[PDB]
């Protein structure tokens with residue numbers, strides 16, 4: 001007997017009541033800008049299927065970022081473009097400024113607004129309680145928006161949250177793994193950074209939803225206020241679930257698996273062992289206590305829950321007392 005099905009408890013049918021044109025990225029015909037508008041200045045980073053460059057738009061002398069896409073599936077390129085276009089102008093969503101294609105080699109590139117990202121080591125030493133609440137609220141705006149627009153980000157992690165702290169500016173980036181939510185759809189569980197993967201991914205439950213992003217966000221919150229980055233530090237996917245179970249406890253994990261009629265690898269049970277649910281206070285120390293409050297812990301507790309259906313939505317999170325001073 002297979003697992004019990006699931007659907008999102010919010011925004012369940014947002015793509016259902018939109019025109020096919022909205023979510024059908026496969027049929028999306030692309031209109032290309034002019035690649036000779038941009039000059040590459042330096043390489044900023046590289047991933048598996050793209051390289052990212054600082055660039056200048058020579059028509060107005062503004063800095064931009066150019067992401068050149070390695071010859072992967074055209075459907076994945078079209079998906080990311082459609083999602084970026086759908087979300088453009090949303091709060092704290094990185095702005096896709098242009099799309100260009102080398103007219104001879106056919107290589108496509110995406111052009112983004114430039115964000116002057118503050119150095120992590122600098123942020124690590126400077127962010128106050130208030131700063132964290134503010135930026136968390138701004139991330140929530142972005143997630144509530146994309147979720148309300150029927151999109152899961154699926155790669156929420158600190159490296160995909162750019163912060164230009166001197167302008168108090170935040171952008172959620174890297175929409176390369178993002179996907180449209182359709183109720184009943186079985187999704188690839190190989191998404192998100194290991195450290196920010198939800199329990200549903202680690203137990204290979206494919207019928208997940210927007211609530212995956214809320215787990216990832218909870219991990220980020222924990223990392224920031226406890227000053228341990230990443231908070232759950234597994235050495236592989238099996239070990240990642242062990243790190244989670246050592247904090248949330250094994251009892252609720254097995255209740256989760258039981259509720260959804262999920263089957264675990266035999267080896268999984270043996271390495272999961274038996275672990276008490278810990279109190280969040282266990283992670284508060286002299287060095288991080290200025291970032292931790294009762295409302296911070298209550299909020300965190302409402303994000304990091306095994307059952308994806310029991311986690312705060314982005315909207316409910318923004319209503320939490322943790323954000324009173326910010327709002």
Ligand SMILES: Nc1ncnc2c1c(I)cn2[C@@H]1O[C@H](CO)[C@@H](O)[C@H]1O
Nearest residue numbers: 044045052065112113114115117173
């Ligand atoms: N829009 C932007 N503005 C400035 N820098 C950007 C971006 C984007 I999208 C990515 N980066 C930087 O490139 C590297 C890989 O993401 C990382 O170092 C990342 O900081």
